């Protein structure tokens, strides 16, 4: 099902709320040990991981270097080794088991650093950093390659995207998106990299566009109904779900669904409560 961990509405949240569009409604599960927003969700071996973020509370604002797994049979969280640095507004992209932690911020410092960690040695090792410092970065994996998409460098919000070549441990700039997007929702559907919504420094976005690898072009697809940045995103059996986010005024509970074969974005259902900055994955 579609799980969402963390988020923010007045303070960082511990929530965990699996959803099933074939079930129709939601389900509440084990709370995160430490509240988190600006985190990323990913599944490795059915094991739902929660990476980086921060706890923005009435008594603090602690950037999280933590990594935490939730076995969905046992319903219990478990602390795994911590990253080299805290990463608020992180991106992550699963790659043959090993988890990739991308960019993010710690205080004033916008990372270009990247580090990996797999469920075996439970260690973090720094790899080549990105060409760009990126927080609010969207991350995707296509043909066993890692794409970092959009984000914010401290001063400029980005339309650029860059690709990590593991066998060479270097980053290469690719064709930029048509739109500057920080805090967008980025995922692979079919074999295109999708990039939905985000913020360009003036306005939240409802536009969506997708990247075709063979032609290296970013085609503009159907836009969503409600502009949103800091949204969750995931693909559930060949369709796209965006959950929550911020539109400059409101913390959204709206969940829209994109149907590719018709190119239409419909609002299937909403969340139990509006929130931004969640981690989303599927297992």
């Amino acid at each position: 099902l579609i799980y969402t961990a963390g988020g923010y509405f007045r303070q960082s949240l511990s929530y965990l709320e699996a959803y099933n569009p074939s079930d129709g409604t939601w389900l509440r599960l084990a709370d995160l040990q430490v509240p988190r927003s600006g985190l990323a969700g990913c599944v490795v071996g059915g094991l739902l991981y929660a990476v980086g973020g921060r706890n923005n509370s009435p008594d603090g604002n602690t950037d999280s270097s933590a990594l935490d797994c939730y076995n969905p049979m046992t319903n219990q969280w478990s602390p795994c080794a911590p990253m080299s640095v805290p990463r608020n507004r992180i991106g992550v992209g699963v790659i043959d088991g090993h988890i990739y932690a991308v960019g993010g911020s710690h205080g004033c410092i916008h990372h270009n650093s990247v580090e990996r960690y797999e469920p075996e040695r439970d260690e973090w090792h720094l790899v080549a950093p990105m060409l760009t410092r990126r927080i609010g970065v969207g991350v995707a994996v296509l043909n066993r390659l890692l794409y970092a998409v959009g984000g914010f460098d401290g001063t400029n919000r980005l339309n650029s995207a860059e690709c990590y070549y593991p066998e060479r441990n270097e980053w290469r700039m690719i064709t930029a998106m048509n739109t500057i997007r920080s805090g967008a929702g980025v995922c692979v559907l079919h074999n295109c990299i999708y990039a939905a919504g985000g913020y360009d420094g003036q306005d939240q976005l409802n536009s969506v566009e997708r990247y075709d690898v063979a032609t290296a072009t970013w085609t503009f697809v159907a836009p969503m109904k409600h502009r949103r940045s800091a949204l969750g995103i995931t693909v559930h059996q060949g369709r796209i779900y965006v959950l929550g986010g911020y539109d400059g005024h409101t913390f959204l509970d709206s969940v829209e669904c994109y149907d590719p074969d018709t190119d239409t974005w419909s609002e299937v259902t909403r969340m139990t409560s509006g929130r931004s900055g969640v981690g989303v994955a599927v297992t």
């Binding site: 923005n56 507004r89 805090g183 931004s276 900055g277």
Partner: peptide, 9 residues
Amino acid sequence: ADEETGEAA
């Protein structure tokens, strides 16, 4: 509130 995430400073 953060223009992008809405979170407080």
